[PDB]
Amino acid sequence: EDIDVILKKSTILNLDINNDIISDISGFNSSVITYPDAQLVPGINGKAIHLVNNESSEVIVHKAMDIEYNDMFNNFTVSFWLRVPKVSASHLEQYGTNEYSIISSMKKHSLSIGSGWSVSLKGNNLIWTLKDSAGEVRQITFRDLPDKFNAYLANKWVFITITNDRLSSANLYINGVLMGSAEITGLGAIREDNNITLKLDRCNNNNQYVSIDKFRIFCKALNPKEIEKLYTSYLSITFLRDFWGNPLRYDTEYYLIPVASSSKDVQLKNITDYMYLTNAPSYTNGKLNIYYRRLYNGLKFIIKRYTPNNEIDSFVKSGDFIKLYVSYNNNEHIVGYPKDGNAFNNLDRILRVGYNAPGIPLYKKMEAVKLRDLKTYSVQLKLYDDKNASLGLVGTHNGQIGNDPNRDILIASNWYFNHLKDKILGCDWYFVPTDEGWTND
């Protein structure tokens, strides 16, 4: 009756990466073969598998004897974290009708049309397919969201769960939410290969890649409550994450975007002065049904270690004390609040960049934290004075400075601390690094 017990108990395969070696830690001890070009990259909670488009980039799981036939007629669930780069507008046109498998239990080099299951991608569709020994087929075709900023197959880590109840349906869940279904009654025996293969199969795009992590198979159809628990069990709050879902790091350029106003980029009035929000330009393609606010405009920021401490980790952990800089023209300019500097009457302190008035204390110590909204890859930043008193969470305040136009100006405010359960909050920030999985069209 413990969901954790149930999850544990029904697990019959669990790909784990430890000491740079991939193995099955289910207890079934299935043998895992890693070919030379399967790579390891940063994942959701440790390293993940990365597959490029060549023959030597694959990971094969040879089923242990005990679990060789558990999906001929039994219910099963497959789960894994998945990361797919955003498909360019030219690649949707050129390769959009090309379906390629990434994970499959179906033979193909001996038995003319492999019965079994597979996970595939086709343009912006994620496809689950079941095929019985009579060649009968059931498919779930999930069509991704047109807005690529909020979509599931657009360079962010997302959690996939597909449950198969032989008496009723197969259901596809993304980040714990039901997004696709298919009635699978009438499917007969599902008699797969003795191998589960992770590899790009039949992909015409030579530069395509995918990343997969925590590949897991359960011998039952999970219910929604078990899936929810499964999904959140991976979200460890110890390390902060960037916009793509990877570990946030020190000494790396990030473009900041407010979670509550995702249409807005950050801009600098002048060095020594304040920051404010501007509208990001957008990309629209009606014929391909794709659109998104363009990334990588606005300020670039860098996170630096407040003190060295204990051991140098490249990743930023929740609770870390840091210093934030704006990076432009090969120069770094610290972000802070000058003692007695301009602030709104309610005490929203206006943040300043490269402030350097002689004699004036400049408050720049921050704590990088995760205070809320667990499944979202966002961060909060808490500013302190020199006595280590809270100056508040970094957020924005609407108003005007001098004769400037009215703007959402970056501030630090303690007000946010009494609203941490709200749905949407002005102190949540996305940290976006330039990445090869996302190029604006």
Ligand X SMILES: CC(=O)N[C@@H]1[C@@H](O)[C@@H](O)[C@@H](CO)O[C@@H]1O
At residue 145, what is the residue type?
A: L
Residue with smaller CB distance to ligand X, 270 or 418: 270
Residue with smaller CB distance to ligand X, 15 or 266: 266
Binding residue for ligand X, selected from 323, 367, 415, 437, defined by CB under 6 A: 323
Question: Within positions 180 to 209, which residues make up the interface with ligand X, using CB under 6 A?
Answer: none
Binding residue for ligand X, selected from 83, 86, 216, 333, defined by CB under 6 A: 333
Least Å distance between CB 404 and ligand X?
7
Is residue 309 classed as helix, strand or coil in its secondary structure?
coil
Residue with smaller CB distance to ligand X, 359 or 402: 402
Across 165-229, the runs of DSSP E, i.e. the strands, are 169-174, 177-183, 195-201, 209-218
**126 contacts 101 by C-beta, under 8 angstroms:** no
Question: Within positions 106 to 145, which residues make up the interface with ligand X, using CB under 6 A?
Answer: none
How far is the C-alpha of 102 from the C-alpha of 118, rounded, in Å?
8
**121 contacts 127 by C-beta, under 8 angstroms:** yes
Binding residue for ligand X, selected from 334, 361, 367, 373, defined by CB under 6 A: 334
Least Å distance between CB 426 and ligand X?
18
Binding string to ligand X for residues 249 to 278, with x set by CB under 6 A, is what? --------------------x---xx----
Is residue 219 classed as helix, strand or coil in its secondary structure?
coil
- CA neighbor of 350 nearest in space, from 360, 365, 361, 340: 340
- CB-based closest residue to ligand X: 342
Q: Is 338 in the site for ligand X (CB under 6 A)?
A: no
Q: Is 308 in the site for ligand X (CB under 6 A)?
A: no
Binding residue for ligand X, selected from 186, 358, 402, 405, defined by CB under 6 A: 402
Least Å distance between CB 324 and ligand X?
10
Helix ranges (H only) for 197-309 are: 224-233
Residue with smaller CB distance to ligand X, 148 or 365: 365
Residue with smaller CB distance to ligand X, 3 or 268: 268
How far is the C-alpha of 268 from the C-alpha of 310, rounded, in Å?
35
Binding residue for ligand X, selected from 99, 176, 401, 414, defined by CB under 6 A: 401
How far is the C-alpha of 431 from the C-alpha of 241, rounded, in Å?
8
Biggest alpha carbon distance in the chain? Answer: 82
Q: Is 354 in the site for ligand X (CB under 6 A)?
A: yes
**164 contacts 170 by C-beta, under 8 angstroms:** yes
Is residue 10 classed as helix, strand or coil in its secondary structure?
helix
Residue with smaller CB distance to ligand X, 358 or 402: 402
Least Å distance between CB 269 and ligand X?
6
Binding residue for ligand X, selected from 285, 342, 390, 440, defined by CB under 6 A: 342
Residue with smaller CB distance to ligand X, 94 or 400: 400
DSSP summary character for residue 28? S
Number of residues that bind ligand X (CB under 6 A): 12
How far is the C-alpha of 95 from the C-alpha of 203, rounded, in Å?
9
Beta strands at 195-201 and 125-131: parallel, antiparallel or unpaired:
unpaired
Is residue 189 classed as helix, strand or coil in its secondary structure?
coil
**Which residues make up the interface to ligand X (CB under 6 A)?**
269, 273-274, 323, 333-334, 342, 350, 354, 364, 401-402
